[PDB]
Amino acid sequence: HVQLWQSGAEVKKPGASVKISCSAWGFGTTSGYSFRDYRVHWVRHIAGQGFQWMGHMQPRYGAVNYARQFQGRITMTREVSFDASGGTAYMELRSLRSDDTAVYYCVTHKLYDGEDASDLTWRLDPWGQGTRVIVSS
């Protein structure tokens, strides 16, 4: 039972930078069931425009892959733990604008407590609570 816990809601200003954490725990230790195998996507939900995909971070080597609209202004880092059954995922959006106000979700792709879903990265079951970032003056 992988659970993802995010940080609190933040109120920023245009031109600022927000760093949302994402604590993940319960992955497991065995290879294929560890945090160093399951990517942590970052999905933005703007009210009215539906969900939007921002990028995913693979926690083994930190290999990130950002969406085209956000290249140059988004950075993802990891804090994978010792046992590799947990960790923390960060995302920094350094060029916040008025249109970036939304609820940001960190998600993984582990549906079941006993399945190796390492190579199926788009079954986004473990959604985070959601960090409501408000960017306004």
């Binding site: 930190g62 290999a63 609209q69 880092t77």
Partner: protein, 448 residues
């Protein structure tokens, strides 16, 4: 009337997994110097390989669901771990280092990369101390808040110095199936890695699969034959690495201009720690050169083959690795016992609309965590003299970016990490089948 007739030795096989042992040429290894990948223990391979062609045989291959690559990954991990077992454990080397930068004949490129660190290390007598100094790279030391430093991997793993006589040179190894098992080789020159293979052959051993560990580039590897081959699990999926194979050499010449000297420090009763004492001569940044015209061409072939999957009107763009550790953001490889991390931004950085050499700055690391093992690290001992490499970029590990919804451009950044993809580019044509030589067929015969 019909009666059951049992036939023994029918040419029938079924898909199955097995234990694939190793075979290698006797002349490949010097027979005097040991190897991190044990070659002496491998059975001596036959001088003449016995490859048998199978006519009228179409078999379904799948390089992404092949147990050969996983078994090879496990084998390499086990070899690397067992090679470090008898070597020296550098637990005393975690002390508080008094480091000062080396400003003796240093170029501006490597102004602060090297640190002359003096520390106190136990001698053979545990009641006496020793004050010794060593040259550590910037990436191998982290400041503690002259200043105070410590090893980068000293709060996360225990350092084990690699044995100076154990060679890290890749030696070809042939994965051979046991008796009753056969290895099917796909001789199709245009094979996407999945689906039927019209030209299926049978071998007893694989070819010479050099265990070259690398990222962003497949070095010293097996080429394609007709054209540059783009092979991905799902080219639409951006989370799947794109494996590229080159039909022609892309020669890359590495070098380490510093003339490092190895100084042996006795850290215990019979244990020796080899440290970079001094460097004789000028200090220059390690770099790797790649012919500009040969790359720009190779990239032209790559984009021509890539435009097939995405359309002929896309603006294919190559860019440099964004984010990640040093093992992914830079081309990581091993050159003569020293680990290089080269900034392959000049190699990529290019946009393709429908004598000169490229110099890639490189950084050297001595504390290496290869397979991301928890609580395990390795200290590569310094290599005396100037190190030079001449390798062949035989492939790429690319990665498409993502949700470009209406955009016509498709950016392909490099990036490896998973060495199973590195060794998948060699085992894509091979497949292990289990021989079932017992079959029943109907005849008009009658047992008396």
């Amino acid at each position: 009337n019909l009666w059951v007739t049992v036939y023994y030795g029918v040419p029938v096989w079924k898909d199955a997994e097995t234990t694939l042992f190793c075979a290698s040429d006797a002349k490949a290894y010097e027979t005097e110097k040991h190897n991190v990948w044990a070659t002496h223990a491998c059975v001596p391979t036959d001088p003449n390989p016995q490859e048998i062609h199978l006519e009228n045989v179409t078999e379904e291959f799948n390089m992404w669901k092949n147990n050969m690559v996983e078994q090879m990954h496990t084998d390499i991990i086990s070899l690397w771990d067992q090679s470090l077992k008898p070597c020296v454990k550098l637990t005393p080397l975690c002390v508080t280092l008094q480091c000062t930068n080396v400003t003796n004949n240093i170029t501006d490129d490597m102004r602060g990369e090297l640190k002359n660190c003096s520390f106190n290390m136990t001698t053979e007598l545990r009641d006496k101390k020793q004050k010794v100094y060593s040259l550590f790279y910037r990436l191998d030391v982290v400041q503690i808040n002259n200043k105070e430093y410590r090893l980068i991997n000293c709060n996360t793993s225990a350092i084990t110095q690699a044995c100076p006589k154990v060679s890290f040179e890749p030696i070809p190894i042939h994965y051979c199936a046991p008796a009753g098992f056969a290895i099917l080789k796909c001789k199709d020159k245009k094979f996407n890695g999945t689906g039927p293979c019209p030209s299926v052959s049978t071998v007893q051993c694989t070819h010479g699969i050099k265990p070259v560990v690398s990222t962003q580039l497949l070095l010293n590897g097996s080429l394609a034959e007709e054209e540059v081959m783009i092979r991905s699990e799902n080219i639409t999926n951006n989370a799947k690495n794109i494996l590229v194979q080159f039909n022609t050499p892309v020669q890359i010449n590495c070098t380490r201009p510093n003339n490092n000297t190895r100084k042996s420090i006795r850290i215990g009763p019979g244990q020796a720690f080899y440290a970079t004492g001094d460097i004789i001569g000028d200090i220059r940044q390690a770099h790797c050169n790649v012919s500009k015209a040969t790359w720009n061409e190779t990239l032209g072939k790559v984009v021509k083959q890539l435009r097939k999957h995405f359309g002929n009107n896309t603006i294919i763009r190559f860019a440099n690795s964004s984010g990640g550790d040093l093992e992914v953001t830079t081309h990581s490889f091993n050159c003569g016992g020293e680990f290089f991390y080269c900034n392959t931004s000049g190699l990529f950085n290019s946009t393709w609309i429908s004598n000169d050499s490229i110099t890639l700055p490189c950084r050297i690391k001595q504390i290496i965590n290869m397979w991301q093992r928890i609580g395990q690290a390795m200290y590569a001992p310094p290599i005396q003299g100037v190190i030079r490499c001449v390798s062949n970029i035989t492939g790429l590990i690319l990665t498409r970016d993502g949700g470009s919804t209406n955009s016509t451009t498709e950016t392909f950044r490099p990036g490896g990490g998973d060495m199973r993809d590195n060794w998948r580019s060699e085992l894509y044509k091979y497949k292990v089948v289990k021989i079932e030589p017992l079959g029943v067929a109907p005849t008009r015969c009658k047992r008396r």
